[PDB]
Amino acid sequence: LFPPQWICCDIRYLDVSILGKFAVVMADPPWDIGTLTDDEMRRLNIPVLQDDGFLFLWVTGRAMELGRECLNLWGYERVDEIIWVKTNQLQRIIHWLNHGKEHCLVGVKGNPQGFNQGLDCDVIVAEVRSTSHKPDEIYGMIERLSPGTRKIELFGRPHNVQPNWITLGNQLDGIHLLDPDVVARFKQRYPDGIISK
Amino acid sequence: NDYCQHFVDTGHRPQNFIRDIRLKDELIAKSNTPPMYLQADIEAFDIRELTPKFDVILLEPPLEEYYRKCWTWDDIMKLEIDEIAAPRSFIFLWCGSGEGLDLGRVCLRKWGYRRCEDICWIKTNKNNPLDPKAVFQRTKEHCLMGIKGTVDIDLIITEEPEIGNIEKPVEIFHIIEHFCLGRRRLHLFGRDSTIRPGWLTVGPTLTNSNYNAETYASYFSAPNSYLTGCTEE
């Protein structure tokens, strides 16, 4: 069901098997550089989310390495790395070096078929709009890569909800599900609507 | 404006639209050792003959992906870089844009470094608007900075060079030298074209050598053993 969907939850505890399988997973996690420990990040049930598709994983600092560990642990091979060059409204760039960019690892799992590889390039030039916000350009790159398929974002905020996407995160407002398969499986697993332990 | 959309529509890469101390450069130029250089087939050469131990190593193995004798990450990983790095020292490793971003990090850790920066060389195509695993068109290269022991930005932006030109941007030298890391500076797989004051360049294609280990060491003998390369001699 194409329009935006979301679930306010603790991603550590949600049973994500009710959500089905996705062509694209994206995450902008609170790496421990309110955060998740390295073990909690390793233990996220990413493997159930896909059979064949791509993972987009934002990383900074020591998560450049830990994110690679997680990606591999979860069953992905890193096959690309997007960099977002941060600019102001006039397109100028904002410990050893000043940082002008943020990194998004791109992982592949299985053997995806029917994706449109090579339409976009691996450099995003876009405005730092609000602090903690990634650029909205990534949604269009992902949509051209895999049009109309179901996608899931982890640790998203209200601004992140998008058609074709299910968004998970604890700053979202309630639960808004429209896909009948997902609605059914959510009701059976969570008949009282509460998501614990 | 969505420059990703624009690239899809026109072929102009987003980085085409990015727009836009001397006394310090002078001190570096004054402290620089004479350029020193040595032809050596690094596959067959005991790099322990390169003394003394270096404060900075710039490592530029010729990867196959640069062309479209090449070195694989198997070859590179087996270089004994820890045998020539000073206990406190730095490494700058050109990793390309493919599996090197992963294998180059294994190399750094194998040689005893931790990565402290990821310098991206972003290539514009203002003048001319495919790995099978690639998801996106690859328009940049990475130079990983590693540290061992106890003004610039992590981006270099130039136009993509002509085919068959494998040179890296000279700006990487500016970044390295502005760190003031010491004066023993080694460039492995450098070329006649990269030779530079303040650097020892070692590589297979050099046409001439002037390297002498005792002469080289005399540049850093007391009272000069600990200069950062950014102070008066």
Ligand SMILES: Nc1ncnc2c1ncn2[C@@H]1O[C@H](C(=O)NCC2CCNCC2)[C@@H](O)[C@H]1O
């Ligand atoms: N167990 C959790 N379950 C669900 N949501 C969570 C959880 N733990 C934190 N979150 C939420 O994910 C978002 C977030 O952390 N992005 C990472 C930042 C990195 C630095 N810059 C960009 C943002 C926030 O909305 C957070 O409240």
